[PDB]
Every structure is written in structure tokens, then in C-alpha cells.
Amino acid sequence: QPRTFLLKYNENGTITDAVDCALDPLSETKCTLKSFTVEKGIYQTSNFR
Amino acid sequence: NNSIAIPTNFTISVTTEILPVSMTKTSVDCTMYICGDSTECSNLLLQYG
Numbered sequence: 001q002p003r004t005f006l007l008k009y010n011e012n013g014t015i016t017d018a019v020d021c022a023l024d025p026l027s028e029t030k031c032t033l034k035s036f037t038v039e040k041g042i043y044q045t046s047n048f049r
Numbered sequence: 050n051n052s053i054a055i056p057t058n059f060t061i062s063v064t065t066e067i068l069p070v071s072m073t074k075t076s077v078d079c080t081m082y083i084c085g086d087s088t089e090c091s092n093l094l095l096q097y098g
Contacts, residue, residue: 044076047076047078047081049081049085049086
């Protein structure tokens with residue numbers, strides 16, 4: 001399905017990890033922040049409609 | 050240089066300062082404001098970075 005992912009490329013240009021930005025709120029925070037690392041806390045990530 | 054004014058009376062008074070600390074925590078979603086659910090707009094909106 002044509003969903004948004006956060007892709008992380010290594011030195012070779014191969015994707016070694018990805019976040020399905022439509023999977024769960026936590027994944028959404030990672031796609032918002034463009035990091036596979038989040039800090040302890042609360043983020044505003046989207047406004048739903 | 051030879052006369053000094055010395056208090057004979059005083060008042061212990063209380064004054065009030067009104068000093069703002071914080072404001073209302075607003076948020077406006079930019080996409081919503083501009084395009085809402087408008088598809089073409091939402092896509093074009095990207096081209097503005």
C-alpha cells in the first residue's frame with residue numbers, strides 16, 4: 001500500500017531500517033522527528049481530521 | 050553642606066505589579082488552514098518546501 005515510510009540508508013545506499021509512519025503513534029513520532037530515536041516525553045506530531 | 054533632612058515619619062506600604070509569565074498555548078495546523086482536504090493543493094503545498 002502506498003504509505004509513508006521513513007527510510008534510513010547506510011553508506012552503500014541500502015535501506016537498513018524503515019518506519020511505517022501509519023503503523024502506531026510511536027512510529028509517527030519517529031517519522032515526524034526523522035529519527036529512529038525519540039526522547040522520553042510527549043510530542044505533537046500531526047492534527048487528525 | 051550643613052543641613053540634612055532626617056525622616057520623622059515613614060509609611061510601610063505595599064504596591065502591586067502585574068507582570069505576565071505565560072500566554073495561551075495555541076496551535077494552528079498550516080495544512081488545514083491552507084488546503085484542508087484539497088488534494089491538489091496539499092501536493093502543490095510541498096513544492097514550497
